[PDB]
Structure formats: C-alpha cells, structure tokens
Amino acid sequence: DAREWGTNLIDKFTGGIRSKISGLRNWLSELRNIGAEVGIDVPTIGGGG
Amino acid sequence: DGGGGGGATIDGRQISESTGRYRSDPSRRRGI
Structure with a gap:
C-alpha cells in the first residue's frame, strides 16, 4: 500500500x-x-509634457 | 505632476487736415 498509494500520495503532497x-x-x-x-x-509624463 | 505642469497714437495734423472739408461745411451751407 505504501508503494501503491504512498508514492502517488507523496507526489500529491x-x-x-x-x-x-x-x-x-x-x-x-x-x-x-x-x-x-x-x-x-x-510615458504618461510625456502625455502631460 | 507631468500633467500638473500642463496647467493708439494719433496725429493732430492729419486729423485737423482731414476734417477741414467738414468743419467749413455748415458755413458754406449758410453762404459765408
């Protein structure tokens, strides 16, 4: 189970x-x-100047 | 702040010479 679920669960984690x-x-x-x-x-400075 | 930085002399001779034709007119209208 630790290699069925556990690997994939640790990938999830x-x-x-x-x-x-x-x-x-x-x-x-x-x-x-x-x-x-x-x-x-x-350039909004230029938009003013 | 870039937007904020975006906020007669009259000749007495020529009058008197020009008006002469008109100043004398009432007297001519009355003979002499």
Whole structure:
C-alpha cells in the first residue's frame, strides 16, 4: 500500500513544495513588471509634457 | 505632476487736415 498509494500520495503532497516553485514564476513575472510595466506608466509624463 | 505642469497714437495734423472739408461745411451751407 505504501508503494501503491504512498508514492502517488507523496507526489500529491509535494504539490505543496511545487506551490512555491510555481508561485516563483508569478513572483518573477511581477519582478519583470517592476521594470517593464513601470515603463508603460512613465510615458504618461510625456502625455502631460 | 507631468500633467500638473500642463496647467493708439494719433496725429493732430492729419486729423485737423482731414476734417477741414467738414468743419467749413455748415458755413458754406449758410453762404459765408
């Protein structure tokens, strides 16, 4: 049972470990926006000037 | 803040010369 259920259940459980390792890509998306999307706000200065 | 930064001299000779034809008119209308 520990090799029938247990393996697959531990794969399920390590979905918890994967939560960080996939949230990481969201976080590095936002850490790109902090360069790339600020650059969409900035030319609104030109929109005024 | 980029948006915020987006907020007669008259010649007495030429009058008196031009009006002469009109100033004399009532007297001509009355003969002399």
